[PDB]
Ligand binder design. Structure first.
Ligand SMILES: Nc1nc2c(ncn2[C@@H]2O[C@H](COP(=O)(O)OP(=O)(O)NP(=O)(O)O)[C@@H](O)[C@H]2O)c(=O)[nH]1
Length: 409
């Protein structure tokens, strides 16, 4: 009465990375006139293979009156301060050095202005980086750190509403020495800290504003019963609440939510994307099956039967073009998909081709138009990666993998 193992069968050679780009994220550093906002920036760029020492060293000093970096799964465009002009991560940078820290909380202090500046830009999950933990006046003191967090914590809730148990991530770092920015500080220097580096965190946290604000989208992953009807799934976009009306596509059926449960069967009032929920719903669910998608009544997830997509073949068939029949799995979908009116090829530098491939096979990729006999929810991988990431199985055994590039009428 369920479904396991989605596109976790993407367990394939690591040329997944090629077609399947990294995730684009917009991050912005809000800081003081002395925070280390720039040195931290510059340090991340060098530390992350983006730029050399001499370049980094430039930026460090050109702080006197679009860049980006990478991480295993994300590319982080850097925005400024005073759609993809709206940030997904707001990192307030504070200095722990005695004097500077305390300074910003007083009168000339922009710390209150910055907190408000965050709220001004839709940061409802502020990452706070407490910089300068190497400083002689800091020495990585567990108390000086824990003194700053508290102070900031009380503060932020007051001046800008940030509740620090669920709206702000605190993390000690050293932009100058690079300690805790890429690799978690080694226990030698600081024994107490137990979390991840700054980039570790940034490379995996779910709360990305753009995504948290997008229309709700949770691919149904299980039909199993309980009090009544349940529906597990990793929310991929937006948020879901209590007593919230939700759509089921492609069956355009409205349906009200009644209770949310997490990975500890404990009733939570809400949940965002990235979470792995176990929603419980109420209504005519006489047509609700795994592979379908829960979504926003106003801006629902798309669902078509014709669409473009870049495919890449695997095993050893030789099968040709316009009429290949296999299994698609995009999210938790599982639907019939017939190769139709093809278009191009691909070669090394994600090229293309001028001649519509005769066929495809063992060692080849292509941007073909596929048709399904019945609608299936999907989005441009470019827009909602998961929701546009499929694989093709044939009579029991895997054969290809693709990302849907364009959705057709
Ligand atoms: N001890 C120590 N000093 C630091 C550290 N980072 C920066 N500083 C000092 O603080 C000064 C100001 O840093 P800076 O990053 O330029 O501040 P900013 O005003 O936030 N930069 P910008 O305005 O360009 O974003 C630098 O001249 C440097 O000497 C650090 O990690 N440790």
């Amino acid at each position: 009465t369920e479904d396991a193992t989605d596109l976790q069968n993407e367990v394939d050679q690591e040329l997944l990375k090629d077609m399947y780009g990294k995730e684009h994220v917009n991050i912005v550093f809000i800081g003081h006139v002395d925070a280390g906002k720039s040195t931290l920036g510059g340090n991340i760029l060098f530390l992350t293979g983006m730029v050399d020492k001499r370049t980094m060293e430039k930026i460090e000093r050109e702080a006197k009156e679009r860049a980006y970096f990478e991480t295993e799964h994300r590319r982080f465009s850097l925005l400024d301060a005073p759609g993809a002009s709206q940030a997904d991560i707001g990192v307030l940078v504070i200095s722990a050095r005695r004097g500077e820290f305390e300074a910003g909380f007083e009168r000339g202090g922009q710390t209150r202005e910055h907190a408000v500046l965050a709220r001004t830009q839709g940061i409802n999950h502020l990452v706070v980086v407490i910089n300068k933990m190497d400083e002689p006046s800091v020495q990585w003191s567990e108390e000086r750190y824990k003194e700053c967090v508290d102070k900031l914590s009380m503060f932020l809730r007051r001046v800008a509403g940030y509740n620090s148990k669920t709206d702000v991530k605190y993390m000690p770092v050293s932009a100058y020495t690079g300690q805790n920015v890429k690799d978690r500080v080694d226990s030698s220097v600081c024994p107490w800290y137990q979390g991840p580096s700054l980039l570790e965190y940034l490379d995996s946290m779910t709360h990305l504003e753009r995504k948290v604000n997008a229309p709700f989208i949770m691919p149904i992953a299980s039909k199993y019963k309980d009090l009544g009807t349940i529906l597990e799934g990793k929310i991929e976009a937006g948020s879901i609440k209590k007593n919230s009306n939700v759509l089921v596509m492609p069956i355009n059926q409205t349906l009200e939510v009644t209770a949310i449960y997490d990975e500890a069967d404990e009733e939570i009032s809400s949940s965002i994307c990235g979470d792995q929920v176990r929603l419980r719903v109420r209504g005519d669910d006489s047509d609700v099956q795994t592979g379908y998608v829960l979504t926003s009544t106003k801006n629902p997830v798309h669902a078509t039967t014709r669409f473009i997509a870049q495919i890449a073949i695997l095993e050893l068939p030789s099968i040709l073009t316009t009429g290949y029949s296999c299994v698609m799995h995009i999210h938790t979908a599982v639907e019939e998909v017939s190769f139709a009116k093809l278009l191009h090829k691909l070669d090394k530098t994600n090229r293309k081709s001028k001649k519509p491939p005769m066929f495809a096979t063992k060692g080849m990729k292509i941007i073909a138009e596929l048709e399904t006999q019945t609608p299936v929810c999907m989005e441009r991988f470019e827009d909602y990666q998961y929701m546009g990431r499929f694989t093709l199985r044939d009579q029991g055994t895997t054969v290809a993998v693709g990302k849907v590039v364009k959705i057709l009428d």
